[PDB]
Amino acid sequence: PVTAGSSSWVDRTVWESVNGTLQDIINVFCSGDEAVTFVADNQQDSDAAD
Amino acid sequence: DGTIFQVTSPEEISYRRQHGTNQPVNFARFGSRFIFYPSIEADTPYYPDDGSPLIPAENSVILSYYADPPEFHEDT
Amino acid sequence: IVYNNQAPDAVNNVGQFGATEGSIGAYKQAAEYAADSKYWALLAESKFGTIDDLIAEVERLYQQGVLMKQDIEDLKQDFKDQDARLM
Amino acid sequence: SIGAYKQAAEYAADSKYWALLAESKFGTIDDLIAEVERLYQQGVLMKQDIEDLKQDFKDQDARLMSLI
Amino acid sequence: TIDDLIAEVERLYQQGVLMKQDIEDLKQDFKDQDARLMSLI
Incomplete structure:
Protein backbone atom coordinates (compact mmCIF):
# COMPACT_ATOMS: atom_id res chain seq x y z
CA PRO A 1 0.00 0.00 0.00
CA VAL A 2 2.37 2.65 -1.32
CA THR A 3 -0.01 5.58 -0.81
CA ALA A 4 -3.49 6.19 0.58
CA GLY A 5 -4.36 7.74 -2.78
CA SER A 6 -3.00 4.70 -4.62
CA SER A 7 -6.23 2.74 -3.96
CA SER A 8 -4.52 -0.01 -1.99
CA TRP A 9 -6.66 -3.00 -2.93
CA VAL A 10 -5.03 -6.44 -3.03
CA ASP A 11 -5.95 -9.45 -5.14
CA ARG A 12 -5.39 -12.86 -3.58
CA THR A 13 -5.07 -15.13 -6.61
CA VAL A 14 -2.51 -17.23 -4.72
CA TRP A 15 -5.10 -17.73 -1.97
CA GLU A 16 -7.58 -19.32 -4.38
CA SER A 17 -4.79 -21.24 -6.14
CA VAL A 18 -3.06 -22.57 -3.02
CA ASN A 19 -6.24 -24.17 -1.69
CA GLY A 20 -7.41 -24.66 -5.27
CA THR A 21 -5.91 -28.13 -5.59
CA LEU A 22 -6.84 -28.78 -1.96
CA GLN A 23 -10.53 -29.08 -2.87
CA ASP A 24 -9.26 -32.32 -4.43
CA ILE A 25 -6.33 -33.16 -2.11
CA ILE A 26 -8.44 -33.92 0.96
CA ASN A 27 -11.18 -35.21 -1.35
CA VAL A 28 -9.10 -38.16 -2.59
CA PHE A 29 -6.79 -39.31 0.22
CA CYS A 30 -8.78 -38.49 3.37
CA SER A 31 -12.33 -38.73 1.96
CA GLY A 32 -13.06 -42.44 2.36
CA ASP A 33 -13.88 -44.50 5.43
CA GLU A 34 -10.11 -44.71 5.96
CA ALA A 35 -6.95 -43.68 4.10
CA VAL A 36 -4.79 -46.74 3.35
CA THR A 37 -4.98 -50.53 3.17
CA PHE A 38 -2.20 -53.06 2.59
CA VAL A 39 -2.39 -55.89 0.06
CA ALA A 40 -0.25 -59.03 -0.17
CA ASP A 41 0.84 -61.39 -2.95
CA ASN A 42 -0.09 -64.79 -1.46
CA GLN A 43 -2.47 -66.34 1.05
CA GLN A 44 0.55 -67.15 3.25
CA ASP A 45 0.82 -63.50 4.31
CA SER A 46 -2.72 -62.36 3.45
CA ASP A 47 -3.64 -62.94 7.11
CA ALA A 48 -0.96 -60.39 8.10
CA ALA A 49 -1.76 -57.59 5.63
CA ASP A 50 -5.18 -56.95 7.19
CA ASP B 1 20.38 10.16 -3.42
CA GLY B 2 18.90 12.93 -5.67
CA THR B 3 15.18 12.82 -4.58
CA ILE B 4 12.98 15.30 -6.52
CA PHE B 5 10.07 16.86 -4.77
CA GLN B 6 6.87 17.83 -6.46
CA VAL B 7 4.33 20.47 -5.66
CA THR B 8 0.69 20.39 -4.71
CA SER B 9 -2.01 22.29 -2.97
CA PRO B 10 -2.83 22.60 0.70
CA GLU B 11 -6.07 20.79 0.09
CA GLU B 12 -4.07 17.63 -0.59
CA ILE B 13 -1.13 17.86 1.74
CA SER B 14 -3.61 18.34 4.53
CA TYR B 15 -5.14 15.04 3.57
CA ARG B 16 -1.72 13.45 3.60
CA ARG B 17 -1.53 14.65 7.18
CA GLN B 18 -4.90 13.26 8.12
CA HIS B 19 -3.66 10.00 6.52
CA GLY B 20 -0.17 9.48 8.03
CA THR B 21 1.49 6.17 7.03
CA ASN B 22 5.57 9.66 2.25
CA GLN B 23 8.14 8.74 -0.48
CA PRO B 24 6.61 11.15 -3.13
CA VAL B 25 7.39 14.33 -1.18
CA ASN B 26 5.03 17.17 -1.80
CA PHE B 27 5.06 20.79 -0.79
CA ALA B 28 3.03 23.93 -1.17
CA ARG B 29 2.88 27.68 -0.81
CA PHE B 30 1.28 29.09 2.30
CA GLY B 31 1.81 32.80 1.99
CA SER B 32 5.47 33.36 2.58
CA ARG B 33 5.92 29.78 3.75
CA PHE B 34 6.77 26.48 2.19
CA ILE B 35 5.13 23.39 3.60
CA PHE B 36 6.20 19.81 3.15
CA TYR B 37 3.98 16.98 4.09
CA PRO B 38 6.52 14.98 6.05
CA SER B 39 8.06 16.88 8.90
CA ILE B 40 11.40 17.24 7.17
CA GLU B 41 14.43 18.60 8.96
CA ALA B 42 16.98 19.90 6.50
CA ASP B 43 19.15 22.46 8.26
CA THR B 44 21.31 25.56 7.87
CA PRO B 45 23.53 27.23 10.59
CA TYR B 46 22.04 30.09 12.68
CA TYR B 47 22.67 33.52 11.09
CA PRO B 48 25.62 32.94 8.69
CA ASP B 49 28.60 34.27 10.68
CA ASP B 50 29.37 30.77 9.36
CA GLY B 51 32.97 29.63 9.99
CA SER B 52 31.59 26.33 8.63
CA PRO B 53 31.15 24.97 5.00
CA LEU B 54 29.87 21.89 6.98
CA ILE B 55 29.89 19.56 3.88
CA PRO B 56 27.43 22.02 2.19
CA ALA B 57 25.38 22.43 5.43
CA GLU B 58 25.12 18.61 5.95
CA ASN B 59 24.37 18.08 2.19
CA SER B 60 20.75 19.34 2.81
CA VAL B 61 17.90 19.92 0.26
CA ILE B 62 18.92 22.38 -2.49
CA LEU B 63 16.78 24.76 -4.45
CA SER B 64 16.88 25.90 -8.04
CA TYR B 65 14.94 29.10 -8.45
CA TYR B 66 14.96 32.23 -10.51
CA ALA B 67 15.85 35.27 -8.47
CA ASP B 68 15.22 38.96 -8.72
CA PRO B 69 18.41 40.49 -10.04
CA PRO B 70 19.71 43.68 -8.50
CA GLU B 71 18.68 47.02 -9.86
CA PHE B 72 21.71 48.85 -11.14
CA HIS B 73 23.06 51.41 -8.74
CA GLU B 74 26.40 52.32 -10.27
CA ASP B 75 28.03 53.25 -13.54
CA THR B 76 30.68 50.56 -13.42
CA ILE C 1 36.45 24.80 -13.83
CA VAL C 2 34.99 27.97 -12.32
CA TYR C 3 35.83 29.86 -9.13
CA ASN C 4 33.21 31.08 -6.65
CA ASN C 5 35.21 34.24 -5.98
CA GLN C 6 32.58 36.70 -7.23
CA ALA C 7 30.99 39.09 -4.74
CA PRO C 8 27.82 41.22 -4.88
CA ASP C 9 28.73 44.68 -6.15
CA ALA C 10 25.24 46.15 -6.67
CA VAL C 11 22.61 47.23 -4.14
CA ASN C 12 19.51 45.15 -3.43
CA ASN C 13 17.12 47.82 -4.70
CA VAL C 14 14.59 45.70 -6.65
CA GLY C 15 12.85 42.35 -6.25
CA GLN C 16 9.29 41.18 -6.78
CA PHE C 17 9.03 39.19 -3.52
CA GLY C 18 10.28 39.75 0.01
CA ALA C 19 12.61 42.73 0.25
CA THR C 20 11.31 46.00 -1.18
CA GLU C 21 12.51 49.61 -1.40
CA GLY C 22 10.25 50.39 1.56
CA SER C 23 11.65 47.47 3.56
CA ILE C 24 15.27 46.99 2.43
CA GLY C 25 16.30 49.12 5.42
CA ALA C 26 14.83 46.53 7.78
CA TYR C 27 16.63 43.78 5.85
CA LYS C 28 19.96 45.63 6.02
CA GLN C 29 19.75 46.33 9.75
CA ALA C 30 18.59 42.78 10.50
CA ALA C 31 21.42 41.21 8.48
CA ALA C 44 30.20 33.35 24.01
CA GLU C 45 30.49 29.62 23.30
CA SER C 46 34.29 29.90 23.31
CA LYS C 47 34.41 31.59 26.72
CA PHE C 48 31.70 29.32 28.15
CA GLY C 49 33.68 26.25 27.10
CA THR C 50 36.73 27.51 28.98
CA ILE C 51 34.87 28.67 32.10
CA ASP C 52 32.74 25.51 32.32
CA ASP C 53 35.86 23.36 32.02
CA LEU C 54 37.67 25.60 34.51
CA ILE C 55 34.80 25.42 37.02
CA ALA C 56 34.54 21.65 36.56
CA GLU C 57 38.27 21.03 37.00
CA VAL C 58 38.75 23.22 40.08
CA GLU C 59 35.69 21.65 41.74
CA ARG C 60 37.02 18.15 41.01
CA LEU C 61 40.45 18.80 42.51
CA TYR C 62 38.74 20.58 45.40
CA GLN C 63 36.55 17.51 45.93
CA GLN C 64 39.58 15.21 45.88
CA GLY C 65 41.37 17.71 48.12
CA VAL C 66 38.51 17.73 50.63
CA ARG C 85 44.28 8.33 76.74
CA LEU C 86 46.29 5.09 76.64
CA MET C 87 49.34 6.85 78.11
CA SER D 1 3.10 23.41 12.21
CA ILE D 2 3.64 25.95 9.41
CA GLY D 3 3.92 29.70 9.92
CA ALA D 4 2.39 32.33 7.68
CA TYR D 5 4.16 35.15 5.84
CA LYS D 6 3.11 38.59 7.06
CA GLN D 7 4.92 41.87 6.39
CA ALA D 8 8.68 41.35 6.45
CA ALA D 9 9.26 44.65 8.26
CA ALA D 22 17.98 38.07 24.53
CA GLU D 23 21.53 39.31 23.99
CA SER D 24 21.20 42.14 26.53
CA LYS D 25 20.13 39.80 29.34
CA PHE D 26 22.82 37.48 27.99
CA GLY D 27 25.37 40.19 28.76
CA THR D 28 23.96 40.64 32.26
CA ILE D 29 24.47 36.98 33.18
CA ASP D 30 27.97 37.20 31.72
CA ASP D 31 28.64 39.81 34.40
CA LEU D 32 26.94 37.45 36.86
CA ILE D 33 29.39 34.74 35.80
CA ALA D 34 32.24 37.26 36.05
CA GLU D 35 31.36 38.31 39.61
CA VAL D 36 31.06 34.66 40.69
CA GLU D 37 34.59 34.12 39.38
CA ARG D 38 35.74 36.97 41.63
CA LEU D 39 35.06 34.91 44.77
CA TYR D 40 36.46 31.39 45.49
CA GLN D 41 39.88 32.97 46.15
CA GLN D 42 39.38 32.01 49.80
CA GLY D 43 39.39 28.36 48.75
CA VAL D 44 43.07 28.41 47.81
CA ARG D 63 59.69 16.46 68.16
CA LEU D 64 57.38 14.37 70.36
CA MET D 65 58.63 11.11 68.83
CA SER D 66 62.22 12.28 69.31
CA LEU D 67 61.40 13.27 72.89
CA ILE D 68 59.58 9.97 73.50
CA THR E 1 22.24 23.88 32.08
CA ILE E 2 24.34 26.66 33.62
CA ASP E 3 21.55 27.57 36.05
CA ASP E 4 21.17 23.91 37.05
CA LEU E 5 24.89 23.47 37.71
CA ILE E 6 25.33 26.86 39.40
CA ALA E 7 22.48 26.06 41.80
CA GLU E 8 24.15 23.01 43.34
CA VAL E 9 27.74 24.29 43.32
CA GLU E 10 26.78 27.39 45.32
CA ARG E 11 25.08 25.08 47.82
CA LEU E 12 28.39 23.21 48.05
CA TYR E 13 30.02 26.57 48.75
CA GLN E 14 27.50 27.36 51.50
CA GLN E 15 27.86 23.85 52.91
CA GLY E 16 31.63 24.20 52.59
CA VAL E 17 31.85 27.57 54.33
CA ARG E 36 47.14 22.53 78.10
CA LEU E 37 48.00 18.82 78.06
CA MET E 38 51.71 19.53 77.56
CA SER E 39 51.69 22.14 80.33
CA LEU E 40 50.12 19.71 82.81
CA ILE E 41 52.58 16.94 81.91
Missing part, protein backbone atom coordinates in the same frame (compact mmCIF):
# COMPACT_ATOMS: atom_id res chain seq x y z
CA GLU C 32 24.21 43.28 10.03
CA TYR C 33 23.08 42.68 13.62
CA ALA C 34 22.49 38.97 12.98
CA ALA C 35 26.14 38.54 12.00
CA ASP C 36 27.25 40.64 14.98
CA SER C 37 25.08 38.62 17.37
CA LYS C 38 26.31 35.37 15.80
CA TYR C 39 29.92 36.59 15.94
CA TRP C 40 29.55 37.32 19.65
CA ALA C 41 27.66 34.04 20.03
CA LEU C 42 30.72 32.06 18.90
CA LEU C 43 32.82 34.07 21.35
CA LEU C 67 38.27 13.94 50.89
CA MET C 68 42.04 13.48 51.21
CA LYS C 69 42.34 16.27 53.79
CA GLN C 70 39.36 14.92 55.75
CA ASP C 71 40.74 11.37 55.76
CA ILE C 72 44.11 12.43 57.17
CA GLU C 73 42.45 14.75 59.71
CA ASP C 74 40.34 12.00 61.27
CA LEU C 75 43.28 9.59 61.09
CA LYS C 76 45.62 11.93 62.97
CA GLN C 77 42.96 13.04 65.47
CA ASP C 78 42.11 9.44 66.35
CA PHE C 79 45.79 8.46 66.62
CA LYS C 80 46.69 11.32 68.98
CA ASP C 81 43.61 11.09 71.22
CA GLN C 82 43.87 7.30 71.56
CA ASP C 83 47.59 7.57 72.31
CA ALA C 84 46.94 10.32 74.87
CA GLU D 10 7.10 43.50 11.18
CA TYR D 11 9.05 40.24 11.39
CA ALA D 12 12.30 42.22 11.33
CA ALA D 13 10.93 44.28 14.22
CA ASP D 14 10.24 41.03 16.08
CA SER D 15 13.61 39.72 14.91
CA LYS D 16 15.68 42.54 16.41
CA TYR D 17 13.51 43.20 19.47
CA TRP D 18 13.69 39.62 20.74
CA ALA D 19 17.36 39.39 19.76
CA LEU D 20 18.14 42.67 21.54
CA LEU D 21 16.47 41.56 24.77
CA LEU D 45 43.77 30.66 50.81
CA MET D 46 42.76 27.92 53.26
CA LYS D 47 44.46 25.34 51.02
CA GLN D 48 48.05 26.49 51.55
CA ASP D 49 47.07 27.10 55.18
CA ILE D 50 46.26 23.39 55.46
CA GLU D 51 49.79 22.32 54.49
CA ASP D 52 51.23 25.09 56.67
CA LEU D 53 49.49 23.64 59.72
CA LYS D 54 50.21 20.13 58.41
CA GLN D 55 53.93 20.94 58.27
CA ASP D 56 53.78 22.49 61.75
CA PHE D 57 52.06 19.38 63.11
CA LYS D 58 54.52 17.13 61.26
CA ASP D 59 57.45 19.12 62.67
CA GLN D 60 55.88 18.92 66.13
CA ASP D 61 55.11 15.21 65.67
CA ALA D 62 58.79 14.51 65.01
CA LEU E 18 29.62 26.34 57.17
CA MET E 19 31.63 23.14 57.63
CA LYS E 20 35.03 24.83 57.31
CA GLN E 21 34.37 27.25 60.18
CA ASP E 22 32.99 24.46 62.39
CA ILE E 23 36.11 22.32 61.97
CA GLU E 24 38.39 25.33 62.53
CA ASP E 25 36.56 26.07 65.78
CA LEU E 26 36.99 22.41 66.71
CA LYS E 27 40.60 22.60 65.53
CA GLN E 28 41.26 25.57 67.82
CA ASP E 29 39.46 23.76 70.64
CA PHE E 30 41.63 20.69 70.10
CA LYS E 31 44.81 22.78 69.90
CA ASP E 32 44.20 24.57 73.20
CA GLN E 33 43.25 21.24 74.78
CA ASP E 34 46.46 19.80 73.33
CA ALA E 35 48.46 22.81 74.54
